[PDB]
């Protein structure tokens, strides 16, 4: 409703770096809000794509940003009559970024790993890895829970059980208020998908450079499965947290699985022990139901509600014809211990191939009416196909069925405007929560400031 579309701010990064693939706000020890941006195709030392991270200070005129430096050198350790290897080439550092406290967590989902023992090997596979940083202090740490030293032969003898070689840890990420990092690994357990959690404080204290394989005893990974419904489901394509069990001492996890049950798609709510409390099945096959998940209380009853995006949903139209436009599902949490029923609201896109629902960002309370609001991206929507971000306002009955404001893309075609969103933070300190929108196709980020309501 009250996002300023006239006077935007623009940050930018190197060409072909996909600057803006992922972003998030970041407050320092003194509360100064900045913007962390991930550029997963930034050039490294060998003039090769490795990714990179930038920490943009707040400036109404935007501009260039300084780099948040991480080690980009490949590592090798000969230990235990074995040889450990890390390959950061095309790792995609910055394909996801998230902030918690004064710490930044940037991840390289496609960092490769291999172990050599004589003529055998573990296979060169993308286990993924995340890089943690405390900018003010300069502290650094890593976290790669899917690295292993098991040889290829062993996996064959065991029928490829608990195979964490293709995890891609960091594909998605989130951190609880308590400080528990939770990584999505949609390739873990032979493309079933796993989760991996660990306290940030324990990641830092248990990490040392050059070890490559170290233990984080406080960590906790999810479990393999024999059920074909989970085969090739990419469990962990998207991840979020919230409260869905009444008990406040516990934190519940939300996991997206856009290809669960033969490309039907599903989202599952779990406890911190990965025990499923509920499951939300897709409505249409290959709609990628679960591509994005958002958690926010939209009706102001204090109970977190759930939002799921199916960007490839094909709406039914006249003459028995389907039209890929996308869709978003709203699930309002019921009072006390009860199951999330059918969706309370169905928001469907309009632009063909627009991919409505590819991203869903909680905005907080934008118009300051008491109800929290959201933004839904259609990175290829709008009459031009350049992109669009639609704002939907909260009400006692859930969400408004029509958007209050539509942000058209200020970038050229193919910018993927809206592929990454983030809101519910007041960066200019005007008392209103603002919205940052990424456009990796144009290597830029657009900041929309919220202003007092005109009406």
């Amino acid at each position, epitope marked *: 409703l009250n996002l300023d579309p006239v006077q935007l701010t623009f940050y930018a990064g190197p060409n072909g770096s996909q600057f803006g693939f992922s972003l998030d706000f970041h407050k320092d020890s003194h509360g100064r809000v900045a913007i962390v941006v991930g550029a997963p195709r930034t050039l490294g030392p060998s003039q090769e794509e490795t990714g990179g991270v930038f920490l943009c200070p707040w400036r109404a005129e935007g501009g260039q940003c300084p780099s948040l430096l991480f080690d980009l050198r490949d590592e090798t350790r000969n*230990v235990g009559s074995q040889t450990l290897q890390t390959f950061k080439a095309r790792q995609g550092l910055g394909a996801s970024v998230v902030s918690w406290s004064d710490v930044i967590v940037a991840c390289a989902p496609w960092q490769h790993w291999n172990v050599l023992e004589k003529t055998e090997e573990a296979e060169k596979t993308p286990v993924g890895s995340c890089f943690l940083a405390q900018p003010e202090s300069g502290r650094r740490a890593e976290y790669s829970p899917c690295r292993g030293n098991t040889l290829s032969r062993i996996y064959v003898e065991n029928d490829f059980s608990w195979d964490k070689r293709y995890c891609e840890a960091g594909f998605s990420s989130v951190v609880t208020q308590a400080g528990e990092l939770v990584l999505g690994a949609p390739g873990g357990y032979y493309f079933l998908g796993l989760l991996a959690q660990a306290p940030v404080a324990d990641i830092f204290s248990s990490y040392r450079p050059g*070890i490559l394989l170290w*233990h*984080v005893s406080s960590q906790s990974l999810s479990f393999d499965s024999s059920n074909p419904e989970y085969f090739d489901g990419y469990w962990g394509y998207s991840v979020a947290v919230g409260e869905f069990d009444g008990d406040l001492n516990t934190t519940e996890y939300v996991v997206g699985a856009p290809t669960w049950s033969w490309t039907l798609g599903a989202v599952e709510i779990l406890d911190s022990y990965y025990q499923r409390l509920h499951r939300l099945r897709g409505e249409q096959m290959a709609s990628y139901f679960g591509h994005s998940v958002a958690v926010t209380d939209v009706n102001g009853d204090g109970r977190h509600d759930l939002l799921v995006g199916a960007p490839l949903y094909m709406e039914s139209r006249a003459d028995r014809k389907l039209a890929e436009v996308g869709r978003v599902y709203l699930f309002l949490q019921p009072r006390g211990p009860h199951a999330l029923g059918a969706p309370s609201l169905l928001l469907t896109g309009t632009q063909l191939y627009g991919r409505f629902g590819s991203a869903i960002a909680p905005l907080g309370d934008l118009d300051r009416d008491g109800y929290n609001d959201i933004a839904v991206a259609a990175p290829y929507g709008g009459p031009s196909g350049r992109g669009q971000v639609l704002v939907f306002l909260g009400q006692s009955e859930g969400l408004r069925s029509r958007p209050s404001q539509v942000l058209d893309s200020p970038f050229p075609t193919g910018s993927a405007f809206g592929f990454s969103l983030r809101g519910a933070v007041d960066i200019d300190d005007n008392g209103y929560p603002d919205l940052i929108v990424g456009a990796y196709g144009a290597n830029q980020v657009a900041v929309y400031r919220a202003q007092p309501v005109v009406k």
Partner: antibody
Framework: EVQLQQSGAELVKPGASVKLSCTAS????????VHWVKQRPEQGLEWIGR????????KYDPKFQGKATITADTSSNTAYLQLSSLTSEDTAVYYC????????????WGQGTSVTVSS | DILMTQSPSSMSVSLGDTVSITCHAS??????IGWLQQKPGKSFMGLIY???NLVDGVPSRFSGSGSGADYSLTISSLDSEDFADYYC?????????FGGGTKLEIKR
């Protein structure tokens, strides 16, 4: 806190077999490797072998192949070391070891189990 | 098998001194070394892992160093409890091999 409670001292006769144990306290034995080390006053410290209690695979120093046999039970959260065809040279204190962070380290040690072989 | 030549076998020193134990390998191990402490009539306690990293709970006066095939454990300002046995162990190759040992004896 991590602690490794090993079994009490053993006293057996030559030619017999003994099975030491290493129970884990404060954590899961399945977390890391579990090594076994032999200590004698004159010969000093010697590495027997290791086991991965998660899958059961083991590695041994060729000096102990046949004599030593390491096993583990995740249920009881305990790791075991069996020594067959005992002799006088098998008279030594045996420790179970695990790393702290580094997968291949030797940081935490049990109290040790004394073994005496004599008729 | 990698041989670990630890020296000296023993040394007589006093409190507050700064001593340095060494450990030589038969080949390079690239900091894949740990340092252990065995107080008399007791079990072992980890001090260092991977050449220089201290084990949690170990005083900061302890410190490891070195590279290649020569490493050194150093204790700044000895304490009454620091008089004990000390061993180096390599895990660069299986089987793990230990050093001879070093006994810190009180001087008088």
């Amino acid at each position: 806190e991590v602690q490794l409670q090993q079994s009490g001292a053993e006293l057996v006769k030559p030619g017999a077999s003994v099975k030491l144990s290493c129970t884990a306290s404060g954590f899961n034995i399945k977390d890391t490797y579990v090594h076994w080390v032999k200590q004698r006053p004159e010969q000093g410290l010697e590495w027997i072998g290791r086991i991965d209690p998660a899958n059961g695979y083991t590695k041994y120093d060729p000096k102990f192949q046949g004599k030593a046999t390491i096993t583990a039970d995740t249920s009881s959260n305990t790791a075991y070391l069996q020594l067959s065809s005992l002799t006088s040279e098998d008279t030594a204190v045996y420790y179970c070891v695990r790393p702290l962070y580094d997968y291949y380290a030797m940081d935490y040690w049990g109290q040790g189990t004394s073994v005496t072989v004599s008729s | 098998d990698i041989l670990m030549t630890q020296s000296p076998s023993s040394m007589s020193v006093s409190l507050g001194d700064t001593v340095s134990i060494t450990c030589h390998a038969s080949q390079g191990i690239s900091s894949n070394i740990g340092w252990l402490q065995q107080k008399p009539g007791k079990s072992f306690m980890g001090l260092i892992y991977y050449g220089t990293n201290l084990v949690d709970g170990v005083p900061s006066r302890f410190s490891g160093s070195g590279s290649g095939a020569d490493y050194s454990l150093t204790i700044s300002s000895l304490d009454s409890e620091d008089f004990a046995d000390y061993y180096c162990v390599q895990y660069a190759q299986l089987p793990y091999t230990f050093g001879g040992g070093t006994k810190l004896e009180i001087k008088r």
